[PDB]
């Protein structure tokens, strides 16, 4: 001969978990009687001696010791359903060279082979669902997820394995959260960081509290997705008895549980010659009324694994096993490592002692959990079955609420009203030019220089034109045509001002020199130095377009899009120097024109002095241009007010300097 195996199972009915042990005996006997009919082991025969371990760490270790002392020479250990005694037995296998093979231990701590080098496991562990969750995330483009872990050994180990599974992939963990008794002193942080996909690792009675608090933060609905473990008892939500059950069902509807698949759905023949459905029928007619345990297929495959491992180990060959033979234990271990065959639960194959099996997904509908897909770990594939998976929204919940850049626009009605007003300014300027050019022969106009007037009307006509180029933002102007228009507008404005005032200062020069074609040459010499200034400007810093983005916070109108306001403007390395040079040159010209006008007004020229008009217009321009320069450069981060000021001051100044020069003569001609 006999080859003895030590089965350690809770067989008594006093324990609640014994319903597992009494569920798998109908299955194991189906494997034992088969092996003896086809006689895989020809000279020997397999016998599994059962020992009751009621999951007490006291009674199970007692049974293990009494089986070691008073029992036959056991070659392997089989079973172990409760993890408290299973870890105790599995950690000590090295002292007797026994190789244990469990079928119901799923805690991930048994996965490391520095602490449990002789332990094998036929059921997929708890941390075997992470590769399935990864393929589920890659199937819906969920590249950013948060986690909610309960601080105990099993769940913390699942989380620590998940951290290493996603490493190397594009998926990102936003925030890791943990709790021990109160789960929603931490759900508020998942709501504050605004994670849309939450991976939960917590027990059964904490899930009800997690969901009843997620109902409070409204962490449910068409924009949130929960992926929790699915090994919970069926109808686990009915057993929670202050929180309403209707709100719990409304908050939990749609979660995707992940758990191992009991039996394979493939119809190919297994190692025993029967298909999984034939084995399932044989099992359901083998046990009369005993409760069906979900571990029966794994016990069947475990017995077949033991049979094949003993076959390969005895063909590898000391015949007896006095628990001291290290070579025989090592041979059995190496023969167990090479297990590879198709059984009723899929392809049984081990990778570092852990089973590579299939993991199913179950989504929660109205009052049930329906299967929605399966992940095969040997082929590393995810097959989501059609028509069964659904979401409360039209599309699957997206993570990373969209951020988008939008320009802070100059209001179109304000630009419209001021562009409609400046064209009225230009048409009245053109009407005054018509008045000047039609009545050029009367002595009331010939007393003044009629050409130094049609230069100032040109200056005002094109400095009115400059208002539009201050409103072109980028809602309707591209990169390069904005960048070059930004210096076209400064040429326009500066040459308009310089002509418009140099012409009246030349007109005053003439009347001051006579009383004690040459009038155009000095305004040309002023434009010479103006264009020299602005070419020295353009050669150093051409006013490259910059764009400032700030305040990524503001909420939308309600369509769930985080709008990021940003705005574009013209700057350079240091605009202060260039603006100061331009304004200082223009102010020097202004003061040296007012001086020469005051010398003319000191002697009272009878009918063409006009120096009071020069004084008033120069005063208004000197105050309003300084104000418009100092207010436009301090309201740059709010461009609508900036434009409404820099356009209004231009309108006011270029209308005053035209009217106070032109209307006093038309009012005495007519």
């Amino acid at each position: 001969p006999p080859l003895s195996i030590m089965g350690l199972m809770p067989l008594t009915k006093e324990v609640a978990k014994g319903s597992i042990g009494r569920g798998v005996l109908p299955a194991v006997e189906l494997a034992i009687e088969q092996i003896r009919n086809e006689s895989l082991l020809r000279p020997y025969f397999l016998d599994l001696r059962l020992y009751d371990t009621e999951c007490d760490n006291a009674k199970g270790l007692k049974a293990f010791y009494d089986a070691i002392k008073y029992g036959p020479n056991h070659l392997m250990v089989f079973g172990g359903v409760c993890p408290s005694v299973t870890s105790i037995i599995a950690e000590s296998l090295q002292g007797w060279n026994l190789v244990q093979l469990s079928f119901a231990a799923t805690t991930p701590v048994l996965a490391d082979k520095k602490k449990y080098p002789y332990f094998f496991r036929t059921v997929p562990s708890d941390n075997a669902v992470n590769p399935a969750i990864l393929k589920l995330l890659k199937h819906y483009q969920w590249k950013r997820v948060g986690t909610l872990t309960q601080d105990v050994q099993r769940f913390s180990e699942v989380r620590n394995d998940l951290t290493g599974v996603l490493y190397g992939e594009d998926i990102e963990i936003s925030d890791t959260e943990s709790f021990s008794n109160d789960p929603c002193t931490s759900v508020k942080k998942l709501k504050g960081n605004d994670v849309r996909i939450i991976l939960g690792q917590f027990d059964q009675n904490m899930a009800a509290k997690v969901f009843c608090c997620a109902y409070e933060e409204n962490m449910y609905g068409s924009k949130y997705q929960w992926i929790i473990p699915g090994w919970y008892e069926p109808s686990w939500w009915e057993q929670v008895h202050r929180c309403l059950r209707k709100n719990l069902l409304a908050a939990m509807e749609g979660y995707i549980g992940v758990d191992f698949e009991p039996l394979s759905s493939k119809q190919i023949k297994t190692i025993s010659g029967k298909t999984p459905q034939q084995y399932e029928r044989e099992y359901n007619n083998k046990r009369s009324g005993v409760g069906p345990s979900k571990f029966h297929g794994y016990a069947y495959d475990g017995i077949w694994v033991i049979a094949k491992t003993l076959q390969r180990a005895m063909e590898t060959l000391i015949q007896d096993f006095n628990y001291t033979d290290h070579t025989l234990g090592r041979i059995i271990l190496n023969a167990m490592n090479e297990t590879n065959f198709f059984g009723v639960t899929g392809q049984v194959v081990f990778r570092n002692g852990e089973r590579m099996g299939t993991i199913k997904f179950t989504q929660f509908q109205d009052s049930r959990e329906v299967k929605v897909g399966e992940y095969n770990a040997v082929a590393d594939t995810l097959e989501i079955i059609n028509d069964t998976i659904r979401f409360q929204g039209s599309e699957p919940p997206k993570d990373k609420t969209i951020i988008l850049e939008q320009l802070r626009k100059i209001s179109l009605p304000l630009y419209s009203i001021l562009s409609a007003l400046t064209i009225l300014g230009m048409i009245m300027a053109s009407a005054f030019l018509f008045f000047n050019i039609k009545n050029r022969n009367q002595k009331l106009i010939k007393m003044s220089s009629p050409y130094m007037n049609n230069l100032i009307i040109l200056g005002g006509m094109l400095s009115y034109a400059s208002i539009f180029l201050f409103g072109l933002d980028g809602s309707f102007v591209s990169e390069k045509t904005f960048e070059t228009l930004c210096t076209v507008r400064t040429w326009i404005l500066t040459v308009g001002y310089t002509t418009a005032f140099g012409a009246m200062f030349a007109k005053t020069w003439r009347v001051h020199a006579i009383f004690k074609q040459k009038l155009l040459v000095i305004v040309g010499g002023m434009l010479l130095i103006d264009l020299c200034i602005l070419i020295c400007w353009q050669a150093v810093d051409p006013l490259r377009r910059t764009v400032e983005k700030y305040s990524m916070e503001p909420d939308p109108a309600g369509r769930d899009i985080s709008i990021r306001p940003l705005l574009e403007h013209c700057e350079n390395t240091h605009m202060t120097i260039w603006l100061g040079i331009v304004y200082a040159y223009k102010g020097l010209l202004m003061l040296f024109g007012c001086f020469l006008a005051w010398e003319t007004r000191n002697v009272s020229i009878p009918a063409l002095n006009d120096s009071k008009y020069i004084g008033m217009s120069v005063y208004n321009v000197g105050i309003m241009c300084i104000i418009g320069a100092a207010v436009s450069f301090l309201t740059r981060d709010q461009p609508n007010v900036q434009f409404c000021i820099v356009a209004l001051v231009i309108i006011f100044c270029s209308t005053i300097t035209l009217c106070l020069v032109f209307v006093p003569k038309l009012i005495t001609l007519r």
């Binding site: 010791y65 105790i88 000590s92 105990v152 050994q153 620590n160 105050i623 301090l634 309201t635």
Partner: protein, 678 residues
């Protein structure tokens, strides 16, 4: 005579805690002193059968099998390491054996329903928690993080610590745990920005934890660690092949971390039941050791192993038959249990008694790693709540690192250089106003000064002086005054500037108005009109200030990083006066004054050509009101747009007052003083 009563023992010589390197010579001595005395047990002889558990329960299971299934029957078991002690104490009830652990600190072993036949001379690890909560309360820390290895001892210690901090108002904001690789929880601690960390794990695991901490940069000025003081005094300098960090690199990662332990040795020079003081015991144990105590593991817990043997002997003494004991009979077990339970005696570790909670040592020692060597920073007794601080804890910067970088609320003030400059300008402006007033009232009627209406110009200069001295309240920020004196600066702005503008514009508006409406004359109506204007203005201002008083209001801005230091992230908040409803009263006031200014400009333009001699200089008055109107209509909405920028608003108000008040006084008075007395 001399019937050998054997005891089983498991001494860990290596592993997570090598206590057996000195706890074995402790019992090997304690068995000789108890067997040499005739009054303790004359008929029996205590003998020891020991193995090496190495803190590994896998070896402990095999050795417990070899102990419980060999011919010589053992009367009691003595496990060491916590996992071995839990295994033995939970399994022993199937053989009716007493368990007496000398070095187990797991708080989970205190319940008598799960371990009904267990005793320990070692105190429970829940004595570290009151000291930790006291050190958290002393330094004002409210948010701590934890990282522990998932052993039952550390899990139960962390649960008790959680209960204690929840009682005291402290919150555990982050929680990490690992089985054999701490890289992931350390990286999560660094990502979560944990400041005050509490580590609950063995030394062999502590070396790996701190190597990943060094590679992760989770040390320095911002972080402080609370470890357990049971490690060797050089655990970070020991060569270890499983961990990469060089010892010189790891000495920086462990720096300034606080560690708590228990005294476990009676400092009094009194003699115990064994007739030896603590110092003689330490000296004899050091003579029995192969190497210095500074390199022998478990040297701190040896008094407990010494006292456990004496407790066992004194409990077997009060029960006096012991050879009939077998694993199938519980009467001898119950007798020995009731004899152990009622044990109370003065041993080397003080008053030894087996209470249910396991708390008999009161003093806890606190120390800190300073420069690669531990220094004792104080002691604490939680039963009396008294903390003896030695004042020797060194910190980087002289203060304990505070967690949770808070918000510091700072105010934005006016640059005092600018305020002082404008105040000097206003002082010179009021002295100019008083000079021109003394001039124009000295020559009251000495010359043609009476041809111009003199009192209107005089009280115009008065209103100008008030409106120009009204810049000091408008510049007084919270830097000079404080909150309690503040609400009067607001009314000292409003009344001064309102009355000043009314008195300095209505007085030279009524002159223009009378020039217009009688020259296109009466001596007292020129005062009646300005009195009506100023009185109605004061009525319209008092109704606003009394119906809706102006009070301080803070406008808070978004957070910014004041990283000119290495300190807290502040948020700036500006303070300025406002009414309960604003921009409606001030808007209507501005609109009315702008309408008056427009009407004044119109009347000054319509009467610029009249050549009356009942009034001397209405043209300079017209120029003055034009300039005042343009300046005020420009700088009224500008300070409404730039309200959230203190310096720009103050400059555009104060300079728009100073220039206007200089121009009006010049334009009115320098022509008259120039032509009158040249």
């Amino acid at each position: 005579e001399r019937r050998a009563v054997y005891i089983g023992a498991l001494f860990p010589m290596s592993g997570g805690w090598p206590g057996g390197q000195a706890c074995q010579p402790a019992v090997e001595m304690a068995l000789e002193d108890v067997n040499s005395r005739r009054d303790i047990l004359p008929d029996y002889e205590l003998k020891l059968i020991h193995h090496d558990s190495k803190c590994d329960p896998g070896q402990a299971t095999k050795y417990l099998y070899e102990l419980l299934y060999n011919d010589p029957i053992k009367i009691i078991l003595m496990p060491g390491c916590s996992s071995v002690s839990t295994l033995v104490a939970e399994a022993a009830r199937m053989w009716n054996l007493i368990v007496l652990s000398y070095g187990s600190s797991s708080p989970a072993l205190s319940n008598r329903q799960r371990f009904p036949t267990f005793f320990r001379t070692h105190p429970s690890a829940t004595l570290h928690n009151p000291t930790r909560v006291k050190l958290f309360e002393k330094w004002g820390w409210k948010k701590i993080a934890t990282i522990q290895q998932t052993t039952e001892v550390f899990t139960s210690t962390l649960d008790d610590l959680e209960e204690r901090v929840k009682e005291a108002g402290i919150e555990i904001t982050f929680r990490q745990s690992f089985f054999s690789d701490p890289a992931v929880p350390v990286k999560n601690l660094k990502r979560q920005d944990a400041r005050i960390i509490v580590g609950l794990f063995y030394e062999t695991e502590a070396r790996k934890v701190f190597c990943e901490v060094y590679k992760e940069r989770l040390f320095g000025k911002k972080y402080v660690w609370f470890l357990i003081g049971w490690y060797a005094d050089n655990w970070f300098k020991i060569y270890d092949p499983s961990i990469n960090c060089t010892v010189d690199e790891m000495t920086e990662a462990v720096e300034g971390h606080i560690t708590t332990e228990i005294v476990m040795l009676n400092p009094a020079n009194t003699r115990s039941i064994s007739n030896m003081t603590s110092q003689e015991f330490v000296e004899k144990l050091t003579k029995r050791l192969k190497r210095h105590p500074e390199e022998t593991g478990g040297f701190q817990e040896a008094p407990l192993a010494y006292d456990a043997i004496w407790a066992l002997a004194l409990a077997l003494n009060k029960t006096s038959r012991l050879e009939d004991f077998n694993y199938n009979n519980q009467t001898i077990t119950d007798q020995i249990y009731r004899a152990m339970n009622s044990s109370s005696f003065e041993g080397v570790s003080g008053h030894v008694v087996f209470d249910a909670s396991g708390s008999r040592m009161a003093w806890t020692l606190i120390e800190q790693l300073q420069g690669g060597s531990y220094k004792k920073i104080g002691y604490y007794d939680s039963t009396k709540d008294d903390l003896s601080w030695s004042k020797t804890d060194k910190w980087i910067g002289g203060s304990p690192p505070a967690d949770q970088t808070l918000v510091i609320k700072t105010f934005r003030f006016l640059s005092q250089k600018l305020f002082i400059s404008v105040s000097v300008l206003s002082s010179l402006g009021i002295v100019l106003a008083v000079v021109c007033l003394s001039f124009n009232i000295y020559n009251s009627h000495v010359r043609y000064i009476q041809n111009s209406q003199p009192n209107l110009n005089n009280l115009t200069a008065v209103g100008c002086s008030l409106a120009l001295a009204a810049v000091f309240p408008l510049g007084l920020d919270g830097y000079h005054i404080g909150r309690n004196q503040f609400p009067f600066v607001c009314q000292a702005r409003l009344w001064l500037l309102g009355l000043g503008f009314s008195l300095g514009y209505g007085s030279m508006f009524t002159k223009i108005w009378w020039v217009h409406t009688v020259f296109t004359l009466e001596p007292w109506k020129l005062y009646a009109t300005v009195g009506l204007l100023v009185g109605m203005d004061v009525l319209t201002l008092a109704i606003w200030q009394i119906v809706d008083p102006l009070h301080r209001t803070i406008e808070t801005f978004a957070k910014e990083e004041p990283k000119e230091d290495i300190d807290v992230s502040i948020l700036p908040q500006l303070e300025h006066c406002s009414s309960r409803k604003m921009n409606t009263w001030l808007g209507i006031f501005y609109g009315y004054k702008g309408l008056l200014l427009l009407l004044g400009i119109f009347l000054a333009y319509e009467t610029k050509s009249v050549s009356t001699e009942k009034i001397n200089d209405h043209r300079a008055v017209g120029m003055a009101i034009y300039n005042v109107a343009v300046l005020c209509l420009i700088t009224a909405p500008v300070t409404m747009i730039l309200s959230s920028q203190q310096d720009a608003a103050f400059a555009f108000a104060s300079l728009a007052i100073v220039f206007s008040s200089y121009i009006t006084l010049v334009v009115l008075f320098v022509p008259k003083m120039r032509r009158l007395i040249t």
